[PDB]
Amino acid sequence: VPDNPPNEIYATAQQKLQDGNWRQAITQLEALDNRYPFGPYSQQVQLDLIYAYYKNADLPLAQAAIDRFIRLNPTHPNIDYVMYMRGLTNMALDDSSDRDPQHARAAFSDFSKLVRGYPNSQYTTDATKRLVFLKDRLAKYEYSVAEYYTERGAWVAVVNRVEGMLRDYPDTQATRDALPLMENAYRQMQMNAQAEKVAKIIAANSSN
Amino acid sequence: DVVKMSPLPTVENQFTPTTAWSTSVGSGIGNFYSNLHPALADNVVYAADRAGLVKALNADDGKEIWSVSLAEKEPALLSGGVTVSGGHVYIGSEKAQVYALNTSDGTVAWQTKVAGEALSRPVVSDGLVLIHTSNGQLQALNEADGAVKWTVNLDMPSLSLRGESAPTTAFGAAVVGGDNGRVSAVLMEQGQMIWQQRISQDRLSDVDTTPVVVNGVVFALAYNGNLTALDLRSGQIMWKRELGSVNDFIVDGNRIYLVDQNDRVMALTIDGGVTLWTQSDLLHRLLTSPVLYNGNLVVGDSEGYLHWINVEDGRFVAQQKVDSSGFQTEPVAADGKLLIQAKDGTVYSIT
Amino acid sequence: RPDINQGNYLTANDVSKIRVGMTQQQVAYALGTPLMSDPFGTNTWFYVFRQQPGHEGVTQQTLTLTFNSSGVLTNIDNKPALS
Amino acid sequence: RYKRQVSGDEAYLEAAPLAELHAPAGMILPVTSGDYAIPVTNGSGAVGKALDIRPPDTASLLVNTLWPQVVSVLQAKNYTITQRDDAGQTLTTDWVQWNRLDEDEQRGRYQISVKPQGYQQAVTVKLLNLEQAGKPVSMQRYSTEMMNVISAGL
Amino acid sequence: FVVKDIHFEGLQRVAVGAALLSMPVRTGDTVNDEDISNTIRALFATGNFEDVRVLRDGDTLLVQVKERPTIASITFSGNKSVKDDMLKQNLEASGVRVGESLDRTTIADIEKGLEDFYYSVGKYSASVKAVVTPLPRNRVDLKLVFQEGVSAEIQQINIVGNHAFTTDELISHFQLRDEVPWWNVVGDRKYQKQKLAGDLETLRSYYLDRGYARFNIDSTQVSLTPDKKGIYVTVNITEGDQYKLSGVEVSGNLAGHSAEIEQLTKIEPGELYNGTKVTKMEDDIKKLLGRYGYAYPRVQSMPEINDADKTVKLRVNVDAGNRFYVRKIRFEGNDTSKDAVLRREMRQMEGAWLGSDLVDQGKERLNRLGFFETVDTDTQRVPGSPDQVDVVYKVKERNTGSFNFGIGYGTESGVSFQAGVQQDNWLGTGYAVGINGTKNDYQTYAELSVTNPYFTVDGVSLGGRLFYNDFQADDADLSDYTNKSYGTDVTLGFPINEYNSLRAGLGYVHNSLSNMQPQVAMWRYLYSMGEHPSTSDQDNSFKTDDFTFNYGWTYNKLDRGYFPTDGSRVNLTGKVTIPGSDNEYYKVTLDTATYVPIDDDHKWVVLGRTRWGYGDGLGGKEMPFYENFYAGGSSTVRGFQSNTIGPKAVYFPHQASNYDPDYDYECATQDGAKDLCKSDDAVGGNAMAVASLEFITPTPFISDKYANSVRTSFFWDMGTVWDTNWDSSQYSGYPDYSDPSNIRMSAGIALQWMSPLGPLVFSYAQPFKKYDGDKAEQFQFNIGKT
């Protein structure tokens, strides 16, 4: 990297962000932030850098930067953006459905914090659209582990699992598709008193 | 690798050293860090090799008297120096065996099992021979029969340097270094501990060898710990000097001469341990313990040179190659003869 | 294929220690917490002692404990095998 | 790894809409937990691929009592007054020593003037000299330090 | 004292609003001496600051801070044996990375840190140093300078106290090693604590198994050469005399299973004390207490010793724990492999009672998949429950694709190249897909394969295979033909037992014969098929399309895979052709290997191999000659050339296809051939029986420190091949190739060990019972895979 004045380096990196070649926009932002790590225009270079890291799929570097931002500027005007952004980076790592949802509920947790705190965010209408996906996505996770244990013949495990789905994710598609597995588990342990109860629930509700 | 070995000093010799004779004793020590040096007692050299071979040599010519091997049939792993006293040659083995062979013919006078590996030069005093085993056990065997009379139990760190302290005797008490960083003082009668004073400075630790006592003060070095002078009676520290080693030092006049763990030789005054001369030209050359030979320090190095250092300024008087296997065990300057054994077992005498 | 164990373990001796009119804290102490309750209104406790060793067929005993509004043992219903 | 560079760009998602299950009569559905429970935050905000996700010498202050109340804190703070022109409403201070807590110390002399500027009165602090560790040399740091010390007195 | 407002000095990176968010003291608060000390140490606990001073103005309470310097870059110097990026990765994990701040009070802990790594891999002279260069705007540039030094090696592993066993022979079974021959992979001479640890366990067991019940390890010393290039370890032992087992008294919270535990501690008195035979019943008890619900049943045995009889009375104490219940088995880390892939390996069931051993079984079941770098198991008490519990597995997934070049060299195959690319966990599905290639003197083999290891949840696998084999009979010591086959296999594999496997599948093969030198045996088969080619011209071709049902059974109870010393392996494998195929045959082969030891240290074992093969046609057709059985070579009857045993070709007089003198031919009319002709070169049979008996012995000359590393055999090998459709009547002048009574026999010595070039087998055999035609080959060998 050169050592020109900061004014023209920010100009260089800005017109690398506008050309959508992030690999070089990063190497100049990184240099600008490492050299001027505080200052009045210091927050702007930190936002551009977490945007760049995200579009170049440098997601660990994006998270590490977003978390250091929120630690040092928890009251900054645009932490609705910074939060929306750590939701995307966590939802990128997810990549959906049968694999570790640690990244999905991380994403969910953050998008929830975005909408509770900033209901008039430009990112809130899209955010709510995202954690409607994420809900039935990690409902789908419970559905698959319920589905494994019904093949295994672990009926106690499958009803306890879908009981949990009714509790945590009731309004999801995954839990509608899950109930007939509960009904089965009951019937298999000759608890058909209880089966008849969940039988009434599927009989009284849409598949949609 | 190894972070910087020193080059052979280039020096004009104020005299010319010569190998009066030399005699081979088996393969020798090899690359197995061992105390095994030769012993001079009554115009006859006593040498040994790790495998068990032990030879009695004539001190003038180096011609064999008796050879005999202590290996049964398995090697003997002889390690514990050689010391002659009372018509007996004492050898500690790493098979926890201590041999005492008759000085006359070389028969086994006795042989005793010991608490562990007998690394230490056997020290003989008050009619007992002192063995410092490798488990921190320090045992006293009767020089007549070889029966263990008492067993003091020094403590041991997680990791030590190889080699144990040969004690010195004064006033019917023995003074050992330990692998703790603690000089200890025990009674020769039953092994009753008197005092135990620490001189040690992740893993940093400090084995010791062989303290020397002159008129009520006892001197000791710790590896990476201090050179200290202690009150014989109390154990009380009188002065610390911050420099540590593993190889014997020697006190003469009111001077200490020693070789650092970086193989730099020094002369300090015994009154305060303030440096008179330092020479750092043999640095990291793997020097032996020094000996005084007619007013000259003699030290062997790993490449098999022994350098003669002027005792008044630290500048070299003579240099000499003599064996390519290398040196590491102590020389023996005594009775107007200088002896050194090289790694391959070859026992030289130097004039 | 391995042994399938499901639900709670019942010694035929720890179902002595339970009798009608006990609190939930006493039965839970006597039998441990149950793997499954009823989540649909009624407050019932199901102790399913199901095991199924390789190519041998299931033996299940179903101890069903019904509690009152207060949370005290009203009805205890158990059966040692399946039909 | 390569699967991340195809999420990080644009890809969209319209997953099955949420719908509340109806409970039959003679029973109830398990108690709702509330952890994964999406609030109905209303409004027309752009949804994915249509949403702009690009990121969004001298110090003067304004405030009879004015001028004598300025020379008063400087006298109570133990700063030696060199040139006091009460008429022209402009004083000069001797070398004031600061602390903060960083590196080696900065020392400067100032010019504190107080004259009306419209409907309010201005207090203009100009950093004349700035000698750090006996070496004249950051510029706003120690003009604002002096402007802050008179401001706290007011 | 009340605070009117709060002011801040020395805030640079930390927003006023961040420091302000950190303090107990608030605007408009009545604070005392203790309240300001409580925010001083709140701000410190932020980790943004070097020094915090909170003192009072008049109205104002003002906060002075010095922010910790922000790292501008991290660079590495002299760091030879560890690569910058990997070592930069460990620093981020520990909290030092570019853009984060450095506390100057840990720069020493940073060095002591990664310098302590170096000590772990035995660079004991290592020295890492941080120089932290200040820059403007409160930043530093820390560079770690390294002096790795030289690795230290074990100069000696001495044992003292050992009288009943020689030092060397005990070191025999040690992982740590003081001597490694140039020609033998017995291990490195490199030190690790983990190695010494399990080695002191190998030493303890060795003694207790021989009845040394009062054997103690008194102390272990690891010494260190001053120059720090040599390591001496010494174990000090007391090996108290042998002891026979008197009886065993069980005493603790047995949960009233005292009935069944006396069946687990039944012993025939006089039998010598045995430490592993003791641990067996400590686990047998702990297993059936586990079988009755209990998570962590503890059993602890204390030998009560009586020196009058020289007997030991085992005083076993056992208290079954409580019962607990697994509410959830979670898996975190599996970011690419689906949940079912590592869930289906569990022996602990969710929604059931936990077994401390069933969760442990289920851990190493994941390690042996080889899909994960690390596999750590955590058992948490589910909040506010006396007995419910979550069991989580924390996996770190590894790149599971690979390229694998193999080169080997044997007397049967010459050089053999193995080479293929392999993906064991296809998109995290447990699916194994791979392209594989083989190539020696006589054949080249390429195959594509997909496997599902769990076709069904119980782990019956469904295979899948396109293959292409290209065979040159000439380069295999056979009557010359060439087969260029290809086709497809799908096979179920059923596990039925820890020790038994089954497999059944169907498969298409398209054989395509050509270049066949005419012989009567190969020809009578072609006349079975109905094809009638020239008996004079070896420019011919035959193309079959077969469909085959393949079955197989494998039994393995070998006590260990390398140098087996006890139990049998047995492999039966058969072929038969479903109708609609050109050919109509069946084939079955059976391999047997039985090891029985004849000493207690298992250093003298006798081994009985037997190899049987039989095949024949069905619809009056014959079994193809390309499916024939062979015998002789290092693999079967040692001392004989590969495939020499059995029927020999009897050729027709033909015209050689590309004739050239200075080149010997077999019955070319170009050399004046008129009628049929006997030969040396074998064709093989449809019925084969070989059986050998090795006598495995201690290798007699090299050091007992590594003697156990080499296995000497003395063997007596026998075998025959014959074909049953041989018209002995019609070919009266020539020998009877339908007679199996012709048993070939050979005797000799075999060596076997692991070298730097790979695993060796030197056979030096001697055929004392050899028939006319049979070609000898007394020295045979194998290097690597062949």
Quickly list DSSP for B77-93. Answer: -EEEEEEE-SSEEEEEE
Determine contact, residues E23/E42, Cβ cutoff 8 Å: yes
Distance, in Å, from the CA atom of B2 to the CA atom of A147, rounded to the nearest integer, reads 61
How far apart are the C-alpha atoms of A174 and A181, rounded to whole Å?
A: 11
Residue E741 has φ and ψ, to the nearest 5°, of -65, 0
Cα B227 from Cα B40, distance rounded (Å): 29
CA–CA separation, B149 vs B146, rounded Å? Answer: 9
**B79 to chain E, minimum CA–CA distance in Å?**
13
Angle subtended at Cα E58 by Cα E52 and Cα E60, rounded to the nearest 5 degrees:
55
Å between E66 CA and nearest CA of chain D: 6
CA atoms within 13 A on the CB side of A57: 14
> Residue E782: which of E747, E756, E745, E752 has the closest Cα?
E752
User: Which of 3.30.30.10, 3.30.420.40, 3.10.20.310, 3.40.309.10 would CATH assign to domain E1-67?
Assistant: 3.10.20.310
For the CA atoms of C8, C12, C14, C20, what is the dihedral angle to 10 degrees? Answer: 100
Residue B263 DSSP one-character state:
-
Yes or no: say if E464 and E451 are a contact pair by the CB < 8 Å rule.
yes
User: What does the radius of gyration of chain C's CA atoms come to, in whole angstroms?
Assistant: 14
CA distance B32 to B34: 6
- Measure Cα distances from A10 to A68, B78, E216 in Å: 21, 76, 72
B115's CB contacts (< 8 A; 6+ apart) are B96, B133, B135, B137, B139, B151, E236
| Contact assessment for residue B173 and residue B185, using Cβ atoms and an 8 Å cutoff | yes
Joined tokens for residue E544: 């079959």
Tokens of B5: 């070995």
Contact E756/C at CB under 8 A: no
- Helix (H) or strand (E) run with residue B241 in it: strand B237-241
Here the tokens at position E48 are 């943004």
Contacts of B148 (CB under 8 A, 6+ apart): B112, B114, B139, B140, B141
What distance lies between CA E188 and its chain's CA centroid?
A: 19
Largest CA distance in chain D: 94
3-state secondary structure of E533: coil
E353 interfaces chain C, CB cutoff of 8 Å: yes
Breaks in chain A at C–N > 2.5 Å: after which residues?
A: 96
Q: Which DSSP category does B166 fall into? A: P
Q: Which two tokens stand for residue A8?
A: 């023209």
Breaks (C-N over 2.5 A) in chain E follow: none
Query: 């193309």: which residue's tokens?
Result: E543
Least Cα distance to A25 among A55, A5, A3 occurs for A55
Q: C76 near C65, Cβ under 8 Å?
A: yes
For tokens 């020379």, the residue is D71
Cα A119–A120–A124 angle (5° rounding)?
A: 65
Give yes or no for A97 touching D (CB within 8 A). no
Among E99, E344, E352, select the one facing A68 at the smallest CB separation: E99
The answer to whether the CB of E354 falls within 8 A of the CB of E326 is yes
Alpha-carbon distance of E78 to B2, in angstroms, equals: 12
Question: Which residue, E562, E481, E466, is CA-closest to E525?
Answer: E481
Breaks (C-N over 2.5 A) in chain D follow: 56, 63, 106, 137
SS3 assignment for E331-348: EECCCCCCHHHHHCCCCC
CB E300 within 8 A of CB E317: yes
Q: Tokens 């040096």 identify what position?
A: B37
Residue among E538, E604, E610, E527 nearest E568 (CA) = E610
Strands E744-755 and E713-722: antiparallel
Token pair listed for B157: 């760190």
Cα–Cα distance between A1 and E72 in angstroms, integer? 14
Distance, in Å, from the CA atom of E154 to the CA atom of E226, rounded to the nearest integer, reads 14
CA distance A169 to D32: 8
What tokens does E514 get?
A: 């050509």
Question: What dihedral do alpha carbons B241, B246, B248, B252 form, nearest 10°?
Answer: -10
Nearest beta carbon to residue A205 from set D22, D41, D47: D22
Chains that touch D (3 or more CB pairs under 8 A): A, C, E
C-alpha span between E341 and D63 (Å, rounded): 72
Q: Are strands E61-67 and E6-9 parallel, antiparallel or unpaired?
A: parallel
Other beta carbons within 10 angstroms of residue B322's beta carbon come to 18
Q: Which three-class secondary structure state does DSSP give residue B133?
A: coil
Residue of B6, B117, B133, B209 for testing the chain E interface, max E β-carbons within 10 Å:
B117
Q: Which of E168, E233, E169 is nearest to E196 (CA)?
A: E233
Chain-centre distance for alpha carbon E50: 52
Q: Could you give the CA distance from residue B198 to residue B177 in angstroms, rounded to a whole number?
A: 10
* Joined tokens for residue E167: 């030092």
Angle between helical axes of A59-72 and A42-55 (0-180°, round to 10): 150
Strand partners, A160: none
Strand partners, E493: E461, E503
| Cβ-Cβ contacts under 8 Å for E274 (sequence gap 6 or more) | E208, E209, E211, E245
Chain D CB within 8 Å of residue A15 CB: no
Sign of CA dihedral E333, E339, E345, E347: positive
CA A52 – CA A17 distance, rounded (Å):
7
Structure tokens at E75: 């660079």
Q: Does domain D58-153 have CATH number 3.40.1160.10?
A: no
Q: From CA D74, how far away is CA D88, in angstroms rounded? A: 17
Nearest to E277 by CA among E235, E316, E320: E316
Whether A160 and A194 have beta carbons less than 8 Å apart is answered as no
Here the tokens at position C82 are 């399946």
Cβ–Cβ under 8 Å, residues E62 and E6:
yes
CA atoms within 13 A on the CB side of D26: 7
Q: Which residue has the tokens 């209303």?
A: D42
Which residue ranges make up each domain of chain A? 1-208
Burial class, D44, CB count within 10 angstroms (exposed 0-12 / middle 13-18 / buried 19+): exposed
Distances (CA, A) of B201 to B224, B242, E498, E782: 7, 8, 59, 59
Q: What Å resolution does this PDB entry report?
A: 3.0
Token pair for E363: 């851990």
Pick from E326, E328, E318: nearest CA to E356: E326
Let me know the angle formed at the C-alpha of E395 by E462 and A154, rounded to the nearest 5 degrees: 55
Q: Contact, E521 vs E468, CB < 8 A?
A: no
Provide the CA B278 distance to its chain's centre, in angstroms: 22
CA distance C47 to chain A (A): 10
Residue E161 gets the label, from left (phi > 0), alpha (psi -120 to 50) or beta, of: left
User: Do E323-399 and E68-150 fall under one CATH topology?
Assistant: yes
d(CA A153, CA A20): 52
State how far the Cα of D124 lies from the Cα of D147, in Å rounded to an integer.
8
DSSP state of E655: B
Distance CA E334, CA E342 (A): 9
HSE-CB for E237 with a 13 A CA cutoff:
29
DSSP tag of B8: P
Q: What CA–CA distance (Å, rounded) separates C55 from C3?
A: 9
Which tokens hold the place of E235? 């174990």
Looking at this protein, which amino acid is placed at residue E424?
A: D
Rounded to a whole number, what is the distance in Å from the CA of E68 to chain A's nearest CA?
12
- Alpha-carbon distance D86 to nearest alpha carbon in chain A (angstroms): 37
Note whether C48 contacts A163, CB cutoff 8 Å. no
DSSP helix, strand, coil percent of chain E (3-state; round to 5) = 15, 40, 40
SS3 E526: helix
CA angle E199, E203, E208 (to 5 degrees): 145
Maximum separation of any 2 CA atoms in chain E, in Å: 130
Chain C nearest-CA distance from A71, in A, is: 42
Out of 3.10.20.310, 3.40.1780.10, 3.40.190.180, 3.30.479.10, select the CATH number for domain E68-150: 3.10.20.310
CB A24 within 8 A of CB A32: no
Q: Residue E669, Cβ neighbours under 10 Å: how many?
A: 15
Length of chain D: 154
Kindly state the DSSP code that residue E651 receives in the 8-state scheme.
Answer: B
CATH 3.10.20.310 fits E243-322, yes or no: yes
**Contacts of residue A157 in chain C, CB cutoff 8 Å?**
6
Three-class SS state of B102: strand
Pair B144, B157: CB distance under 8 Å: no
List alpha helices for chain D, DSSP H: 66-76, 139-153
Q: At what angle do helices A124-152 and A102-117 cross, to 10 degrees?
A: 150
**Are E628 and E648 within 8 A, CB to CB?**
no
The rounded distance, in Å, linking the Cα atoms of A141 and E331 is 12
Which fold is adopted by the domain E151-242?
Ubiquitin-like (UB roll) (3.10.20)
Q: Which residue type occupies E163?
A: H
Bridge partners, residue E586, by sequence: E576, E616
- Enumerate the domain spans of chain E: 1-67, 68-150, 151-242, 243-322, 323-399, 400-786
Could you give phi then psi for residue C35, rounded to 5 degrees? -65, -35
Q: A155-168 vs A124-152: helix axis angle to the nearest 10?
A: 170
| Partner D contacted by A199 (CB < 8 A) | no
State the Cα–Cα distance between residues E638 and B126, nearest whole angstrom: 72
Name the residue among E333, E338, E350 with its Cβ closest to that of A149: E350
The phi-psi region of residue B58 (left if phi > 0; otherwise alpha if psi is between -120 and 50; otherwise beta) is beta
Q: Which residues contact B163 (CB under 8 A, 6 or more apart)?
A: B33, B35, B119, B207, B209, B246, E223, E226
Which of D5, D31, D53, D102 to mutate against chain A (most A CBs within 10 Å)?
Answer: D53
Residue from A169, A176, A186, A196 to probe the interface with D (highest D Cβ count within 10 Å): A169
Q: Name residues whose C-beta falls within 8 Å of residue B76's C-beta, 6 or more positions apart in sequence.
A: B50, B51, B52, B69, B70, B93, B95, B97
Tell if the CB–CB gap between D102 and E51 is shorter than 8 Å: no
* CATH number, domain E400-786: 2.40.160.50
Cα E598 from Cα E696, distance rounded (Å): 10
DSSP per residue, E459-492: TEEE--EEEEEEEEGGGGTBSS-EEEEEEEEEEE
First-to-final CA distance of chain A:
56
Q: Two tokens at B303?
A: 């490449």
DSSP structure string for E35-55: HHHHHHHHHHHHT-EEEEEEE
Return the residue matching tokens 């084969």: E688
Q: In 3-state terms, what secondary structure has residue C2? A: coil
For tokens 């030590």, the residue is B160
